[PDB]
Amino acid sequence: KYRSCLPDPISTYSPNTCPQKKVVVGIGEHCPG
Amino acid sequence: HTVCKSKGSIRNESWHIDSSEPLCLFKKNFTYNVSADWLYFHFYQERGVFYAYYADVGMPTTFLFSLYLGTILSHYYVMPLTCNAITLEY
Ligand SMILES: *[C@@H]1O[C@H](CO)[C@@H](O[C@@H]2O[C@H](CO)[C@@H](O)[C@H](O)[C@H]2NC(C)=O)[C@H](O)[C@H]1NC(C)=O
Numbered sequence: 001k002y003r004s005c006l007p008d009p010i011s012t013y014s015p016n017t018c019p020q021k022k023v024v025v026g027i028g029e030h031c032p033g
Numbered sequence: 034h035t036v037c038k039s040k041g042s043i044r045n046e047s048w049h050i051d052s053s054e055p056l057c058l059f060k061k062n063f064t065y066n067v068s069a070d071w072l073y074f075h076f077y078q079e080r081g082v083f084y085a086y087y088a089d090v091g092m093p094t095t096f097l098f099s100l101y102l103g104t105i106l107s108h109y110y111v112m113p114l115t116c117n118a119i120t121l122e123y
Pocket residue numbers: 060061062
């Protein structure tokens with residue numbers, strides 16, 4: 001589906017809106033992206 | 034969608050479309066009892082390791098295999114069957 005993640009997803013003012021959530025890497029897993 | 038080996042549609046194949054053999058990680062063949070009523074399967078994952086158990090005779094299941102992927106599996110499908118004469122439960 002189509003889309004604010006503005007200006008950057010790392011320093012966004014509202015992290016609850018951008019779909020790119022911040023997660024940590026578990027055991028036996030890699031970086032999701 | 035998959036088809037039967039008795040009377041199929043005009044397509045006869047819809048699993049993949051890639052021509053060149055892609056890079057794989059695990060490809061095996063197993064045997065099962067043909068004169069059976071139910072086949073029990075147990076798939077799961079833990080710490081990036083995918084385990085699968087299979088049974089053809091009896092209700093309890095036995096170890097079948099286990100492999101390493103490194104990612105997290107999300108979805109699964111059933112690949113509906115398309116045949117001309119057929120009952121089918123899953
Ligand atoms: C697993 O078994 C299947 C058949 O059940 C094999 O697929 C056949 O492979 C031969 C030789 O490569 C081909 O000539 C046939 O056309 C294939 N049949 C089908 C329906 O694809 C498969 O190669 C086996 N895999 C392994 C690793 O042994």
